[PDB]
Write a structure and sequence with these properties.
Chain A: Component of a late pre-40S ribosomal particle, composed of the 40S ribosomal proteins and the non-ribosomal factors DIM1, DIM2, ENP1, HRR25, LTV1, NOB1, RIO2 and TSR1. This is part of a larger assembly, with chains A (271 residues) and B (48 residues). By secondary structure, chain A is of the alpha+beta class. Chain A is built from 8 helices and 12 strands. Chain B is globular, with a radius of gyration of 12 Å. Chain B starts with a strand and ends in an 11-residue tail after the last strand. The chains are: A alpha+beta (271), B mainly beta (48). The structure holds 4 RNA strands.
Chain lengths: 271, 48
RNA sequence: AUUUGGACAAACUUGGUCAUUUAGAGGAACUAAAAGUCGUAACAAGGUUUCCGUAGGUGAACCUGCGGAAGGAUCAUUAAA
RNA sequence: CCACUCGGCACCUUACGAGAAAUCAAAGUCUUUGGGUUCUGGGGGGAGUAUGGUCGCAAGGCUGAAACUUAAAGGAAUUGACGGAAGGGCACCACCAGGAGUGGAGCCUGCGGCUUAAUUUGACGGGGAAACUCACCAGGUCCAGACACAAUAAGG
RNA sequence: UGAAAUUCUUGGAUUUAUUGAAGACUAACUACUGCGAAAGCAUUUGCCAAGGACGUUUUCAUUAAUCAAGAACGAAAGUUAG
RNA sequence: GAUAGUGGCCUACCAUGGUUUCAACGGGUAACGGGGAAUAAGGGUUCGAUUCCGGAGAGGGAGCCUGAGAAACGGCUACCACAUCCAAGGAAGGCAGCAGGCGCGCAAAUUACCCAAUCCUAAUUCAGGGAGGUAGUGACAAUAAAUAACGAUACAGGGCCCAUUCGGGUCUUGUAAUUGGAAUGAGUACAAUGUAAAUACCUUAACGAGGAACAAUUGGAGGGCAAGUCUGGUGCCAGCAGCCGC
């Protein structure tokens, strides 16, 4: 409790100034002697959790990406989250995705964000908060999407979903209803006011419950591509979504549309 | 001269963290309550 | 022995006043090498010409009238040498 | 307009001299310390607060503490280290004109992860590969240890 | 007004022109300055009563300097009564 | 009038004076006044209950007898406050004198000896004196100054000149709980001196040290400020403490 509290205090000793000198980490902690502060900073620096910037007549301490997530783990110790860390499935551009587990033993997904001194951390924070709010907007509207657990300042911990992408999915039996689904869902996107331009094969994720009841769903992860309908180029974005669905269903599922697909002028009488 | 009423664990925090060993006394001549330091005895084993 | 009247005048009582030693009883407030709770702790940050007198409303704070001070960073541009 | 003279408000040099310095023709003639005279201060808070007096319709003014607390609070001058100012290079590990592409399929190969008894070990290691190389496992084994020193002897 | 909303305007606002009333100020000129014990003082003209400096071959002859006590004045704001 | 005696000292009758910013009057004092004490280049600052002089008091007030002299406390009387004995009727009391006890507090001695000094009192050379002197207790201060001094050896050096080399002596160190012969008081004590009697001092027969114990302590060793670049433990009572602190 206590060491994590003092590490939270020097976390709160970051939102005061720029690159923090040694005596501010001495005094913001407010600890007893030279021992705790100096040996803690040395434990940080040897684990690369802190770095020394010595700009003339001026010692200072430079926090890298390492010595933050513990506090996030402490922030997630508060919010009942992950206990065990590490299984690499997917190293993305603006996040690194890991498979983790709680005290309860259910596996979850840990997207750490790495987008120094304040701005790498803070822009990872803005990215995590923005994606968490977009996930909140999608789940509040009712879109079938993974359920968010938390957004530990810059690391998003969410659920794991049993799905595999459509590139390894040959076909299903109810192909025209799947086409009506992947038309009406982009219709629902235009009724939300947004167009997800990367509506590709690798986006769409299908969970598979049974083979008799047919009670399943979908997962759509296109977050840095959703564009409002008011922008300059949304017409052929919508048409690229529709036509990628149609060209995939012609190439893979060998299905041509008997009803005509919706245009942007069709969906202008929507939202 | 006075009569010991209490032993006191006073605390000195900054910048020196130490546990000061003191004694609350009531003086005989006045009826005056005065705290006072007692040196060199970590146990206060000579004082009750 | 006793006794009248005087001045000297110790003391005593009655009140009323301050100045106190107290005891008790009534209340109020300050503290924790005490321990747990909610409020803004585990929350965001924000204001930033600075003051002086006076008046007002205030709120966790502080602002607005009237008049002074600089204890505030004079460039250029006319002439001179 | 020129020249002089008083009496002002200001200016601008210097330093003879002063001062801690900024600065000062007085803030000079002060350790080489004395022209006359009025008032004020004695580290910082507590505090221009408490109480009393006095003045006032009121608001307030004048006068004015102590307990307690503390090693600094200050005045002037000096330097550049967290200035998130703007401007140039000058680069296909940058962009535009493009070309070949990767990430799309299968497979080869390096890392991570899992698994194990070991998947030896680093961040191409000349680390190309059944033996070796092998640095890892399952086992099975030799060979240890000098000199000193008490016994033990050539029929042992 | 960074941005915007209350108010007024078809009986006419705002703006334009001709007038009239009220009370307050005294710009530019205005500094490279002046006066006043300070606070303070910028339109004309007049009245009253002061004042500094200058000049003096006028007068008195120490009447002086600084001032607890005491006394006048004292921006702005604020109190009472027109 | 009263007094020893002037004097509002008091009384009768008259006046309306007297003091004051050159500080009256009131208030405070952990204020007896002075000779003096401590500390300084000078000028000053602060104490003076305390050995000498003067004042005042004998639990608090008051009053008085005697006497030249007292408003006397080791004299009396009354009140106030304490307090003693008692057969309950009465009767005695003042240590801010010398000792000593309680209380109080950081804070302070013996219920000893003596009139031999120094003086004083009396009817007086002789008697008397806790005045005073003497001794005890006494690290209040102050003076003087034991806890060792010489040798020889070696060994290690250093220096002086002769060194051509040895070695020829002069010193001075260091050690070696190595050795030698000396000196003497602390202490004990015949005696004598001392003194009123003693104790102690000054003398002195006889003992009295290698002193591995006739054993010198108190505060320090970052800086101020002389002294550690040393070792161990600590580093959960510890970077800590006139100040700065690492």
């Amino acid at each position: 409790t206590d060491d994590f509290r003092v590490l939270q205090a020097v976390e709160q000793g970051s939102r005061s100034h720029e690159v923090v000198p040694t005596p501010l980490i001495h005094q913001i902690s407010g600890m007893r002697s030279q021992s705790g502060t100096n040996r803690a900073i040395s434990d940080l620096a040897k684990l690369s959790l802190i770095s020394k910037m010595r700009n003339v007549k001026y010692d200072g301490y430079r926090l890298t990406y390492n010595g933050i997530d513990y506090l996030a783990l402490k922030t997630m110790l508060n919010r009942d989250t992950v206990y065990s860390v590490g299984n690499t499935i997917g190293v993305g551009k603006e996040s690194d995705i890991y498979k983790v587990s709680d005290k309860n033993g259910n596996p979850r997904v840990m997207k750490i964000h790495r987008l120094q001194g304040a701005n790498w951390m803070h822009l990872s924070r803005l990215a995590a908060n923005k994606e968490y709010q977009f996930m909140s907007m999608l789940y509040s509207k009712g879109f079938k999407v993974p359920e968010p657990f938390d957004n530990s300042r810059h690391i998003v911990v969410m659920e794991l979903i049993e799905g595999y992408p459509m590139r390894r999915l040959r076909k299903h039996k109810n192909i025209p209803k799947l086409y009506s689904d992947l038309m009406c869902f982009i219709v629902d996107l235009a009724n939300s006011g947004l167009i997800h331009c990367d509506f590709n094969e690798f986006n769409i994720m299908i969970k598979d419950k049974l083979e008799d009841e047919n009670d399943c769903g979908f997962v759509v992860i296109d977050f840095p591509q959703c564009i409002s309908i008011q922008h300059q180029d949304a017409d052929y974005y919508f048409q690229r979504d529709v036509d990628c669905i149609r060209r995939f269903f012609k190439k893979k599922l060998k299905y041509e549309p008997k009803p005509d697909s919706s245009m942007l002028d069709t969906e202008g009488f929507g939202d | 001269k006075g009569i010991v009423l209490e032993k006191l664990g006073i605390e000195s925090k900054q910048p020196n963290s130490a546990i000061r060993k003191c004694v609350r006394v009531q003086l005989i001549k006045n009826g005056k309550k005065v705290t006072a330091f007692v040196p060199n005895d970590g146990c206060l084993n000579f004082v009750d």
